[PDB]
């Protein structure tokens, strides 16, 4: 019976110059998980374990600096949530002396103002991602037939770790929630033209406006996580003798796919609670709309 939105962490933004995803939940960067996976490789790769020193000094700095960067946007985040709470509750909307179509544009102005803060405060941090990746690519080189027992042992464990995520359960959740949302936007198009109840219908139209944004993010991760699952499984189905140059390309293959897997799984569980909370608002509003 929830009527207001407490959590608005479903907002994310990708940088335009270089394409990186910034989520409000830690670690904020999918690359940080890729950095966290190299510690498992370094412990099992060879006697060289110098990454344990860079993981505690350089990797945590990026994570800690990014968490601060997201924390600077509290003023933007609280002001965005304020516009979201107003346009959702008619009891909180009838207090102000402004119209819905008048302050519905103020929402978009602040919605993008907050997303700009998530990127600008992390723009200085994205440079360290390319600086750490080069450092990882530099420290790993220290032969024409390097071993591969560790590479394939990771793929065998990833497939078991992939089954921990309910992908088939998340996929069916979309097609039923998406069609139910399309049936909701269809009903208001025929009631708003025959029934004169503008104040309540505006909240249902606004809630559906944000629902499409979260469905987009919930879908966008589902295929990208699926693409990682489908590729990591493809590397297993498709040696024991590899050069050291391809070993850097081989570790980046499993590293980029698994870091995307864990980062997308972090967004999906968050966007799941966001979608259910949005549906509870539009479900209990139909009881008041009728």
């Amino acid at each position: 019976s929830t009527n207001t939105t407490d959590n608005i962490d479903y907002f994310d933004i990708s940088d335009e110059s270089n394409y990186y995803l910034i989520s409000q939940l830690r670690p904020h960067f999918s690359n940080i998980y890729f950095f966290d996976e190299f510690k498992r490789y370094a412990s099992y790769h060879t006697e060289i374990k110098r990454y344990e020193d860079i993981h505690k000094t350089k990797v945590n700095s990026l994570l800690n600096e990014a968490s601060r960067a997201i924390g600077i946007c509290n003023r933007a985040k609280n002001t965005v949530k304020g516009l979201i709470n107003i346009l959702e509750n008619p009891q909180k909307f009838k207090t102000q002396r402004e119209s819905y179509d008048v302050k519905l544009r103020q929402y978009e102005e602040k919605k993008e103002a907050f997303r700009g803060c998530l990127l600008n405060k992390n723009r200085k941090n994205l440079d360290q991602i390319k600086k750490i990746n080069n450092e990882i690519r530099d420290l790993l080189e220290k032969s024409q037939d390097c071993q591969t027992n560790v590479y394939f042992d990771m793929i065998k464990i990833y497939l078991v770790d992939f089954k921990k995520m309910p992908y088939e359960n998340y996929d069916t959740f979309i097609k039923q929630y998406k069609n139910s949302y399309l049936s909701g936007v269809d009903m208001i198009r025929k009631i708003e033209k025959q029934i004169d109840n503008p104040v309540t219908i505006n909240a249902i139209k606004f809630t559906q406006k944000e629902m499409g944004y979260i469905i987009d993010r919930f879908e966008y991760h589902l295929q990208k996580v699926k693409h990682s699952i489908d590729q990591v499984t493809a590397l297993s189905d498709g040696p024991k003798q590899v050069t050291k140059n391809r070993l850097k390309e081989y570790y980046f293959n499993i590293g980029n796919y698994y870091s995307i897997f864990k980062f997308g799984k972090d967004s999906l569980n968050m966007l799941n609670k966001a979608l259910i909370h949005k549906e509870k608002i539009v479900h209990n509003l139909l009881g008041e709309l009728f």
Partner: antibody, heavy 119, light 109 residues
Framework: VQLVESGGGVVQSGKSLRVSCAASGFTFSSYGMHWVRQAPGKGLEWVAFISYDGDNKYSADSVKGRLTISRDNSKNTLYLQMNSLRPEDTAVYYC?????????????WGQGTMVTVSS | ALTQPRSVSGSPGQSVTISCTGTSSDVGFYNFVSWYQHHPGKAPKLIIYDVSERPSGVPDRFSGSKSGNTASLSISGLQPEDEADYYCCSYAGTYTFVFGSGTKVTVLG
């Protein structure tokens, strides 16, 4: 939303005690869980943290390498096990829940169970 | 352990404040500090998350503020139900948290 925890009354020194926090009224498998203990004299302090899956488990530096934390999503319980106890850590262990408003706050807390260390 | 006063005193209808200053990397670096109200036997409930905002059930009397490495909680219009122990909590970093020492807010009877 209710967080019920259960802990033993007395524990011998250097022995292990397991603490279980049963969650209900909300989706336990989607929220993070925290442990907080409070000595009879001092105030409460942060102890550890688990993600919703259990893949990320972290603890404070004071109890690092001494306290093991885990969760059972099917049984909907939060588990904390402390090994090699010392008479200085006898405290009321509270079961904290990750906040709905954000991951940097604690929304719902547990009642707290008293654990005494006397051999 | 963050440092806050040992005891603060206020009369019914008065306003008091509580300082919270730990380290330079704990409080003043993250803007993720928080405050919790602990009754003698009851479970501690969250009053103020982040720097200045409050959950839905928290009255208008509690105020959140922060400057530098010093966070501050403010309670205006004290009522006899406000007598409790108050702890500040800041995000330490690397998935860790730190709690304050605690203040025994006592309404003057």
């Amino acid at each position: 939303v209710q967080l019920v925890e259960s802990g033993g009354g007395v524990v011998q020194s250097g022995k292990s005690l397991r603490v279980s926090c049963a969650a209900s009224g909300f989706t336990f498998s989607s929220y993070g869980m925290h442990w907080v203990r409070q000595a009879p004299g001092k105030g409460l302090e942060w102890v550890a943290f688990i993600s919703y899956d259990g893949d990320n488990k972290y603890s404070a530096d004071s109890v690092k390498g001494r306290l093991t934390i885990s969760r059972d999503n099917s049984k909907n319980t939060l588990y904390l096990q402390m090994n090699s106890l010392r008479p200085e850590d006898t405290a009321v262990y509270y079961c904290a829940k990750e906040s709905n408003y954000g991951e940097n706050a604690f929304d719902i807390w547990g009642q707290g169970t008293m654990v005494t260390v006397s051999s | 352990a963050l440092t806050q006063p040992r005891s603060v005193s206020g009369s019914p209808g008065q306003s008091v404040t509580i300082s919270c200053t730990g380290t330079s990397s704990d409080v003043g670096f993250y803007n993720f500090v928080s405050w919790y109200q602990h009754h003698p036997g009851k479970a501690p409930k969250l009053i103020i998350y982040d720097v200045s905002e409050r959950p839905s059930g928290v009255p208008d009397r509690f105020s959140g503020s922060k400057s530098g490495n010093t966070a501050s909680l403010s309670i205006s219009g004290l009522q006899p139900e406000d007598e409790a122990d108050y702890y500040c909590c800041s995000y330490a970093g690397t998935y860790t948290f730190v709690f304050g020492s605690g203040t025994k807010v006592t309404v003057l009877g």
